[PDB]
Design a protein around this nucleic acid. Sequence first.
RNA 1: AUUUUUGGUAAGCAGAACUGGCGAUGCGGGAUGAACCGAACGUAGAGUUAAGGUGCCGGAAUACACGCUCAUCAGACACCA
RNA 2: GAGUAGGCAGGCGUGGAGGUCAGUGACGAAGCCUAGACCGUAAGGUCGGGUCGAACGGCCUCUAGUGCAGAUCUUGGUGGUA
RNA 3: ACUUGGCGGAAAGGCCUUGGGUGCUUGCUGGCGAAUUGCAAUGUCAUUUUGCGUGGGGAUAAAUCAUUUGUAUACGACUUAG
Lengths: 48, 156, 180, 122, 105, 197
Amino acid sequence: GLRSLTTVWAEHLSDEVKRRFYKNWYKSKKKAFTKYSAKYAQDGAGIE
Amino acid sequence: SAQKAPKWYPSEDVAALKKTRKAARPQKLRASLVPGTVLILLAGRFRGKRVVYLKHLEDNTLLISGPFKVNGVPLRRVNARYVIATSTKVSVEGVNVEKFNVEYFAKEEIKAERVEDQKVVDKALIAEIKKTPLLKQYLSASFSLKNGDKPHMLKF
Amino acid sequence: RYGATSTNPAKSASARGSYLRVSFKNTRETAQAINGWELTKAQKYLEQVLDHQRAIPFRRFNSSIGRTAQGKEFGVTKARWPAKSVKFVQGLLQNAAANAEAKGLDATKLYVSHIQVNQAPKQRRRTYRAHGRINKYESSPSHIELVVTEKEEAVAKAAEKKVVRLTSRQRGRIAAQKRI
Amino acid sequence: PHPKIVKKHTKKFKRHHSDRYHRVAENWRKQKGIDSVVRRRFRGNISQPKIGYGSNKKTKFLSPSGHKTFLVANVKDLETLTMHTKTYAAEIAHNISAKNRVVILARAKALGIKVTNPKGRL
Amino acid sequence: AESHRLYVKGKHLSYQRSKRVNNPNVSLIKIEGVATPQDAQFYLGKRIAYVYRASKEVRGSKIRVMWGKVTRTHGNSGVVRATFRNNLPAKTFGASVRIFLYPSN
Amino acid sequence: VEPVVVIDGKGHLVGRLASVVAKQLLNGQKIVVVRAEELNISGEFFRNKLKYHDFLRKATAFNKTRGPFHFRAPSRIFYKALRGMVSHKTARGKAALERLKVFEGIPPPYDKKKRVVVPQALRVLRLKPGRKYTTLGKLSTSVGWKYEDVVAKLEAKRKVSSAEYYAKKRAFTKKVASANATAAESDVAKQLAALGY
RNA sequence: AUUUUUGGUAAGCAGAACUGGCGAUGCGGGAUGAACCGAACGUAGAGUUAAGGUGCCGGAAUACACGCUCAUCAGACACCA
RNA sequence: GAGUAGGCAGGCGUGGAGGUCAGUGACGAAGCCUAGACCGUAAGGUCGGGUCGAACGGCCUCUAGUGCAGAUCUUGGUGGUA
RNA sequence: ACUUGGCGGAAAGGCCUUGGGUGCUUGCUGGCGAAUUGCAAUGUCAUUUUGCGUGGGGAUAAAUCAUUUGUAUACGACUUAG
């Protein structure tokens, strides 16, 4: 059947969709998509 | 009395054996083992070597020596149940093997006599070999079973 | 006296409580929750499970009892808060810790090395059932006894050699590979 | 000297259902049931004692050593196996005191009689 | 150079069995490249060994060896019967054995 | 002989292949079957459809889950027919079936590996010319299997790329055969033709 | 239970004749089965066979030879379904 | 060289009894525990280790309230359900 | 061991393909060495799961309970919030 080859996100995900990935959110350092956002450091090489 | 007493104790005098009717006869070596034949060794330190057959001993073993300057195999005993006689034979009408007996290989580094008399037989053997083409390179090379090779189908 | 231990009596103190009127099954389970801990983490844990913050995981005597979230800590689904058991073992932790201080053991490395709950003789009452029958109504008291020892690392280091036996063929091949 | 000792059935003849029940001991007892699979000898059940298993008469009562075991109480009893050293092995009785074992082992080696027990009782 | 082989590749098929009952004394061995009992009769009386690796060094090496010899042929299709000094353990049904060219001819 | 055999399951009788493979696995020979969707069964499409529908209707009444699972894929139809011919309940059988893999088409690593056949389980070698047969590609989909033409796409891609590979290998083997033919009439070549090689 | 045989539509029913079996009997085979087939049994080794089989499960020829059969309800080993 | 019901024979084990081994034993009897050992086709016997603390055994014979898994057995104790 | 351009997504985790370097070469003649593993004893050379100290690169969190909600709730669980 169908299988997910890969997913790519935009560098700027709102605090709305960031809150999704945590169950004890306000204790967290909110480090979700920090390294993934830093993959847009150059002209989005990892993204392209 | 922890135990009463057995009244009859066996005669602990040991009896003599019956006179065995079987005297040792001289071995019937298979026709394929003729002094001068190249034997593939099957076991021991020198397993899968090619060796040259020189003499039948009193112990029903084979005095052989793949000349030390071809395959590093000295003058050695080898059992005939651990050799494959090849159909290739070197002339052995110029070697004095009459020196070697069973007490020669009494075990009781290497002895100087044993090294020099190795060199004496080796000189005669390598003189006979170098006549025939590729036979030193054959004797140099070791034996191994390959893929597709069926021992029962393989002639020697 | 004091069931099988593999620790040093020079570095141990013990405490015994015979014929203590507690549910044997509850007090076996508080003892197996506390076993192999530091005495400080153990004492603190028993006050937490009295005021319903963490629970005693019931592992063996865990039949038709309600599930609870406070079990997830221990990788179980079913846990409880045996007040009476917890209070009796607390009394025996404290009494052991007092003997361990009176002998002179550093109260910091003191960790419960052995804890065992046996069954006491059952106490006899009679209930009254329908159609004028009598039944037994038995308490199952407990024999609690625990040991607390000082923690020591640097062990084994053990044990034996490679006292090897070889044949002429083995030793000859060793002498060959050396010559190579 | 002796022929190479064989024992046709080495492992013990445990009573049927001795494993199953504690009331039942493994001390061999013949199954005298009307439907017993052990008595009727079905393919897969335990083997029963049969005279056919009987050990060779030349190897019977010999230990691995090759000596018929003789229980010995005191030196008086040991001094009977004097002309029978190739034949027997003295074995001190279970109820003999340590000091009496000192005397027997002294006398046993002095005559040259093999012993299986002490040990010297340390 | 690559090859070092001085045995034939045998495989432990099964024991000598009925439709149901098995005889663990006679082990059935399939030899590589044999077809009939006639082809198999070369290997009658040869020395088969089962080489396996334990985790404990016993007397120099962690490898141990269970020795046997070919007794006779089996069936129509070149299988042989082997007897081993100690019987094989049966977990080796499909494990390779080594058919040496010992007692030679 | 090989460490792992690879069998092209095309133009093969299901049960005959299954018996051959079942004995290989118990003897302890690692085998993968590929192109399991071109297997064949004796008798017309309809007979084997009805045989399957007779198998489908067999379910555990009191809970149709725990009942006999009816696997629809041609790879899993073969596996059923092969697991029938092994004592799968025993540890030897579990270990024997562990040596087997079955695929609908020729995936990776096996896409560039050599593919054998088993002449005693070929339709062409066995069935009388005139008798009608099934294709597990059509049967499997008529009974539930969804991926008929996903496998037809992936096979059509693999066969284009493998046709390019062969056309290059053959074009080369012309140069190797030509140079080996121009090595004849040499001292060495006459000595080899004497020894037979 | 084969054969002879009475009653009975009949029966894994009732009742007889001769013999052989189970009962009181394990073992190899008929998948399984008291009775069918083969063979009756101390403990082992080796060899050879019985009935029955030798695609795979499953030890053993996907043996050889002459024919027949294509079934959208094939057929497949006596007692026996 | 099979075997139910059954018969007979040869033994194994227990409480006592007469005789004997000038038997063993507080430097440890008997009892109990023992993924230690040896003997016996077996019933069983013997030994090592532990616990324990006051008696007990081999052999030739006499005698019997003499050998247990079943009796919805008896008494006492114990469980799983929980 | 390193570079060149590429090609592979069905499980592509692999296929090619450059130039270079550094080793070997039994294509062919040479020159030494090998014994004593004693007449066989697998006579040990493969592929994993590895924590263990070394010395270099790199990054610097979450979940659970307790509290809270009611889109959920027998108890767990689920959804919320801090």
